[PDB]
Every structure is written in C-alpha cells, then in structure tokens.
C-alpha cells in the first residue's frame, strides 16, 4: 500500500542470505561424501597460511562445489528465462500483484525445500529441485521485474530515474543487511539457523504482496496466460516497433546494462577473496567494514543521483558514476595496503548511480503498457550477467594471481569504458 519497495527488500534479503548458506551446504555435503575434514573455504594466500603446497582433495572439493553451484544456477536461469518473459508481458495485461505474489511463493517453496535438504542432509541434487520449482513460478528475477515495472507504472517521465534509484537503493540496503547480518550469523551457529530467515523473509514478502500491496496497473485488461503473445511481446519490443531511431538505443542500452552489471557482480565476489589475500590479510572485522562500505555506495548514490540532477541531465550523472567506479576499481587493483583498499571503497561513493540511470533510460523508451515486457527482458539480462560475471571473474582471479593480483578489478574497470562510451555517444548523437 505504501509501495513495492518492501517486496524487493525482503526478496533481496532472502536471496543474499540464500547464496552463501547454499554454497556452505554444498561444501559440507560434498566434503563429507569424500572424507575431507578440513576448512570449507578455498585455499588461502600468504601470511603463513600454508606451506606453499597444494591440496589435491581440497581443490577437488572446491571444484565440485563450484560445478554444483554452476549446475543449479544454470538450471534456475533457463527456467527463469522461459518463465519471466511469460509472466511479465502477462503482468502488464492483468496487473502487478499476481506477478509479485507468485514469485514470492516460489521463493518460499525453494526455501522450504532447501531447509528440508539441509535438515535431512539429503543429496545436493535436491537443491536443484527447489531451484527449478521456484524458477517455474518465476524467481527473484520476476520479483525484480515486477517491482521495477510497478515503479515505472506509478511515476512521471521525469521522476523515473529517481524513483528507480530509490528502489535500487532499497535493493542494496537489503544486500547490506544480508551481508552483515548473516555474515555474523552464519559464523555463529550458522548454516542452518540463519536459513530460517530466508523462509521467513520469503513468507513475509508473499503475505505483504498478497495483502498489503497496492496494484498500479491502471486499466487492467483480460489476458490469457500461456498464449505465446507473451514471448512475442518482448520480440516486438526490440525488433519490430519503435523504428524512429529508438530501436538502436534499446540494443545499445541493453549492451551497456549487460556490461555494467556484469562488472558489478564479478567485482563484489572478488572483493573478500582479495581483502583476505596475501599483502592485505584482513581480519574478520576489517572485511565486515569492507562489505558495509561496499554496500553503502548504494545509498550514497541515491543521494548523489538526486543531488546531481539539480544541475546536470540524467545521463551525465551516469557518466560521473562510471568514472567513480573506474577510479575505485583501478585504485583497488593497485591496493597493497588497507588505506588504499578503503580509499577505493570511499571513491566508489557514486558507483551505483549508473545502473538506475540505464534502467530508467530504457523504461522511458517503451510504451506505458510495455514496462512489464521491458523489465522482464532486463531481468533475464541481469541473470545472464550474474552467470557470466561469476564465470569470467572466477576464471581471471586464479590465473592472474602470481602475476598481478587485482588485474580482475582493472579488467572490470576497462570493461566499464564501453558503457561510458555507449551512453555518451547515445546522448550526444541524439542531441546533435
């Protein structure tokens, strides 16, 4: 009834608590099945943590865990690919409440299946069952698409950038709460007890959407689910209509969004593996401060975005955001000490003002009745970006480990030169 922000807050809390606990269970079960009584992390680096020798069994269990995360994530991604683009275009024809209630129920169901597997110590393949069951009903991707479409359907043309930044800042606040309230909960009797908050958060989101949420689709029509006019409505969004030079901009902004969120997703994960690296060797509290400072960039940018719009357009704000991300990811790449590592975190205080800008510039190119289809496409792109970021950056970091640590961060900074060029070119050519 206030808005759809609490829905995304609870769903993001559920997802950000689910990821580390699920991979921790994968570590526990896969190690136990092979008689490996050892630490559940990857191999350490420097500061005497080891003797330099490699562990054939720990590396094998780590590879197994990475492969099983890949398997469950790809299964979820494919079923979400085929479900989000069916439930979004439908959502813009029947309303946003059903498509924000179904995925929350699916998330609660996968949380229940995960709890059943963790408590019964069942095979890790039944995690894939919960992932597919949630993915069919639309997953956290569909919560994202429905929330962004609801914000796009309840705001002006000028207010979309700020009202999307507000919701994305709520997304990141939920991420911070997950990171530093399941970070210090997963350590203390963790891995099962913190998982009850995933089910609790998903149930709370389902109840809030079903009861306390206010529908924003003004003239709700009568549409049939399972029609094939929902898969056609994302194709006749990118290729057929909007021929008046606003069809190239959809592809270019989708490309910029892909690269930008790929860089963000990869660089968050390498952050703790780097912080507790060889010349840093951060303790448990320093990396907690690091995670917090990484997840305060969200709100500091919901502030810098709103402040900078008083003098600039809504695109140069994103250009400034991409220079803050590049200065941070180049500084962090060259950080061999804690003042230089935390300066990089501080420099990225406007890093997250470019994703909401791209989302809004996409949402202002489509009709008011296609904000479901557009953000279904965007959610699918953000899932693919998560997968690609994981693969690329977890392949770069081990390889460029004895040559230059932080090269993954510098490569992410280099990749951010393409969204900046794309967005600057798009604005300059149109305004000329």
């Amino acid at each position: 009834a206030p808005s759809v922000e609490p829905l995304l807050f609870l769903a993001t809390l559920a997802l950000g608590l689910q990821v580390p606990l699920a991979t921790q269970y994968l570590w526990d079960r896969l190690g136990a099945e092979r008689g490996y009584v050892g630490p559940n992390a990857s191999s350490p680096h420097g500061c005497g943590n080891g003797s330099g020798a490699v562990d054939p069994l720990r590396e094998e269990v780590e590879a197994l865990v990475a492969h099983w995360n890949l398997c469950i994530n790809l299964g979820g991604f494919f079923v979400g690919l085929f479900s989000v683009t069916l439930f979004g275009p439908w959502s813009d024809s029947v309303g946003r409440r059903p498509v924000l209630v179904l995925p929350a129920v699916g998330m609660a169901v996968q949380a229940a299946v995960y709890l059943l597997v963790m408590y019964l110590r069942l095979h890790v393949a039944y995690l894939l069952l919960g992932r597919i069951i949630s993915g069919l009903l639309g997953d956290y991707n569909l919560i994202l698409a429905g929330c962004f479409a609801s914000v796009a359907d309840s705001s002006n043309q000028r207010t979309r950038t700020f009202r999307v930044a507000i919701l994305e800042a709520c997304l990141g606040v939920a991420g911070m709460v997950a990171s530093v309230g399941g970070g210090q909960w997963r350590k203390a009797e963790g891995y099962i007890n913190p998982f009850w908050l995933v089910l609790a958060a998903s149930l709370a989101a389902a109840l809030y959407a079903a009861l306390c949420l206010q529908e924003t689709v003004k003239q709700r029509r009568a549409a049939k689910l399972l029609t094939l006019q929902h898969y056609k409505a994302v194709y006749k969004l990118y290729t057929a209509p909007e021929d008046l030079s606003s069809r190239r901009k959809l592809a270019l902004y989708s490309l910029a969004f892909f690269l930008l969120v790929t860089v963000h997703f990869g660089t968050k994960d390498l952050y703790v593996l780097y912080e507790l690296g060889s010349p840093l060797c951060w303790a448990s509290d320093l990396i907690g401060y690091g995670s917090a400072a990484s997840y305060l960039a969200y709100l500091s940018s919901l502030g810098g975005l709103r402040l900078l719009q008083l003098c600039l357009e809504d695109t140069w704000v994103a250009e400034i955001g991409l220079i803050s991300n590049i200065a941070g990811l180049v500084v962090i790449s060259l950080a061999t000490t804690t003042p230089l590592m935390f300066t990089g975190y501080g420099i990225m205080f406007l890093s997250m003002a470019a994703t909401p800008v791209i989302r809004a510039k996409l949402s202002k190119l489509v009709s008011e009745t296609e904000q479901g289809a557009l953000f279904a496409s965007v959610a699918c792109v953000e899932g693919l970006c998560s997968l690609v970021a994981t693969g690329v950056f977890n392949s770069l970091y081990p390889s460029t480990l004895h040559f230059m640590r932080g090269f993954p961060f510098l490569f992410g900074a280099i990749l951010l030169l393409i969204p900046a060029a794309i967005m600057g070119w798009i604005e300059i050519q149109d305004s000329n």
Partner: nanobody, 117 residues
Framework: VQLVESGGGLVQPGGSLRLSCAAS????????MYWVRQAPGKGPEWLSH????????KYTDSVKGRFTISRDNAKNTLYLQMNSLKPDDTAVYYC????????????WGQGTQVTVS
C-alpha cells in the same frame, strides 16, 4: 594471532605423542579447530576438526579411532593425542583455526615436526 604447537619430536613406533596448540590473538572459543600434517614430499593430509564446543568431531580414515582431538577453551590449548604411531606418520603437524564460514580467514600454526622412527 599465532597458534604455537609443541608436542613433537623423535618417538619410536608405538608412541603416544600429545600435540598441543596454544592460541593467542583471538577468542579460541568461537573458532573451529583442525589438525593437518604436511608429510615430506606430499601435500596437506587434514586429520581432524572440532566445533567450538566439541560436538562435531570428524576424522579421516587413516586416523579414525587412533588420533583423539581435544580442546580446552579454559586453557586455550587445542590437543591431539596419537596412538600406534607408524613411520608413515612422519610429518609437520599444523594447527589451523577457521570459522566454518566462507568469509572468514584461516590461521595456520607454525607446525611441529613428528619424526616417528
């Protein structure tokens, strides 16, 4: 933070070395405790682990019912007693201290040198 082990040394086969590991620099009552031996010309051979209480005690097959991990949160000295020592047990026994979390560091020890012969 340092975990210092001292129970090693030359013991004839059929020995009863009691390894100790005194942790100074953290709580030691919130950390899981392991035991690893890097045998000469090999890699780590993780031997045991124990939760901050003593409820989750896990071994490998080459030490099951033969090595007996133990910790004293009061004394802050993790132990490990070794029965039926064989010249296959010659190694450098380390003493790591994880948190059984994916965003927490490992604190290896210096490593004693058991030379069963």
């Amino acid at each position: 933070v340092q975990l210092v082990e001292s129970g090693g040394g030359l013991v004839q086969p059929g020995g009863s070395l009691r390894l100790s590991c005194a942790a100074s620099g953290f709580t030691f009552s919130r950390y899981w405790m392991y035991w690893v031996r890097q045998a000469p010309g090999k890699g780590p051979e993780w031997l045991s682990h124990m939760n901050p209480s003593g409820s989750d005690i896990k071994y490998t097959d080459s030490v099951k019912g033969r090595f007996t991990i133990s910790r004293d949160n009061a004394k802050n000295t993790l132990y490990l007693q070794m029965n039926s020592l064989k010249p296959d047990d010659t190694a450098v026994y380390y003493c790591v201290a994880d948190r059984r979390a994916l965003g927490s560091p490992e604190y290896w020890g210096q490593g004693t040198q058991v030379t069963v012969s």
